[PDB]
Amino acid sequence: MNLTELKNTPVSELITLGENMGLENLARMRKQDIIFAILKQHAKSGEDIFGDGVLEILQDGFGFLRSADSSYLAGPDDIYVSPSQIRRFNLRTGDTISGKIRPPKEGERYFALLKVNEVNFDKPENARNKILFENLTPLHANSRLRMERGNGSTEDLTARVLDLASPIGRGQRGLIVAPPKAGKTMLLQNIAQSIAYNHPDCVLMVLLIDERPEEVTEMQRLVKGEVVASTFDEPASRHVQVAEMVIEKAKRLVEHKKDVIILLDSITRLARAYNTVVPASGKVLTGGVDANALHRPKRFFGAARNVEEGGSLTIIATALIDTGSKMDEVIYEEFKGTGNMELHLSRKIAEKRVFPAIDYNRSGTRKEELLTTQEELQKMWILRKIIHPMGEIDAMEFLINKLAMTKTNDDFFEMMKR
C-alpha cells in the first residue's frame, strides 16, 4: 500500500488494520514501529508498496527519506537510499523523492528505495537540470501578498491592520518582534489563514521550534499546509535538524520556480539551539552566546529572497524580547538590520486586551513603493501622518474603531479621506 497514507491514519485504525493481517501486540508500540511492522507483513504478499519523503544525506554519504508527518524525525519506517542512487540522480538534501520501495534484505534494517518516480514533483530527467539556489540573483520584493480576506469578520481586522502597518511581498525577509503574553501565536495563525485563503498557489510551511506539545496540535488543526515542529522535550540537536530540513526543502522548491513561505517561531529559540550544538570557538559574547554560533541561523534567515529567474522564498520569523534572559537580548541585537520587514508587538497594548497589539509607529517595511501602487502608497502616507503623533495605546484603539466601521481598506481610505 501507500506509505504516506499509513502515516495519516489514526493509531486506532492502524491496529485494527494490523490485527486482521495477523499481527499481534501492536497496541503497546510506537506508531513508527507499527507502520514498519505492517509494511513487512504486506511485503510478504509481494505487492508493490509506494512511499515518499524528503532526502537527508548523512555524513557517511547515504541518506534517508524522512516524512513530514513525524516532523522529519528519524524512525524505523524511514527509507534508505544508497550512495549510488545519490550519484545516479544528483540529489541534495531536501529533495522530495517518491517511488516504489522494497522490504529490507538479510542484514539490513530499513526499507530501501526501489524505483524513483518523481523528484520534487517532477520527472528525474528534468529535476537534475535545475540551477542551484546559490546561483540565483536576489531581488527586492515586488509582488505583494495581500492578507486582507475582505469578508468583514472580526478575525480579518488583524489581517487588515497588517496591510496598513507593514505590507508583505513574495521574497520578503520579515521579523516580528514580540514580548511574552503579546498574542504572538494568534498573529501567526491569522497570517497562515490569510495566506492559505488568498494565495493557494504559494507553498506554506510553518516551523515551530522549542514549542509546547499542545501548541503543536492546535497549529496542525488550523494551518492549511505543512506544520513541522520540535517540542522542548527533544534535544537541541533535534531543533537544528528540523530547521535544516525545512530550509533545504524550501530551497529545492524555489529552484523549480515556486513561491515558498516559511513562518518561523522563533528565530530566538533556533539561535539558542545552535549555540548549544556548535563547538565553542573560545570567543563568547555577552550572555553566553558564542561568536560563531549565530553564523548558522543567519544562513537560515538570509535565504529569503525574490529570485529574478522565478519563484521566491518568504521567511517571517519571530524574535523574543523582554524575556528576562540576557541570551535573548544579544541574539535580537544581531538580527536588527537583517530583515527588510519589521513588525512590533507591544505588551502595553496587550495588557488592555485590545488586539492585535501591533506597535504601528515602530513597524514598517523597506522599499514599500514596489509592493503598493502609487495611489495606495499615498493613502498609507496620509494615514501614517495621523497615527504618528498619538501614543501607541491610542493608535490601535483609533485604528481598530475606524476599520471596524468599514469592510475593506479602500472603503476605510475614502471614509478617512472625507
Partner: protein, 82 residues
C-alpha cells in the same frame, strides 16, 4: 525506442561489480553470453551506459538492454522492466 531506467537495487549491484572490477557474465533475452569485465558506469544524454570489455573491446551498451548477470560473489539477479 524510449529508454526506461532500471530499478535501484539492480543499479547498485552493477556499480558494486564495476567498483570491484570483477568478471561479469552479461546475458540477454536472445540467449547470448558475454563473460567480460565492466570498468565503470557512465551516463550520456540522460541515458546511462555500461562499458564492459573482454579483450580490450570496451564496448558500450545500454543498461535496459541487459537482461541477466551472474557471478559467484553476487547473487544471480535478473532485471525487471516494470
Amino acid at each position: 525506442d524510449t529508454y526506461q531506467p532500471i530499478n535501484c537495487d539492480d543499479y547498485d549491484n552493477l556499480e558494486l561489480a564495476c567498483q570491484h572490477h570483477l568478471m561479469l557474465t552479461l546475458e540477454l533475452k536472445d540467449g547470448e553470453k558475454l563473460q567480460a569485465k565492466a570498468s565503470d558506469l557512465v551516463s550520456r544524454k540522460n541515458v546511462e551506459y555500461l562499458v564492459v570489455e573482454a579483450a580490450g573491446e570496451t564496448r558500450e551498451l545500454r543498461l535496459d538492454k541487459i537482461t541477466s548477470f551472474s557471478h559467484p560473489e553476487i547473487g544471480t539477479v535478473v532485471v525487471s522492466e516494470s
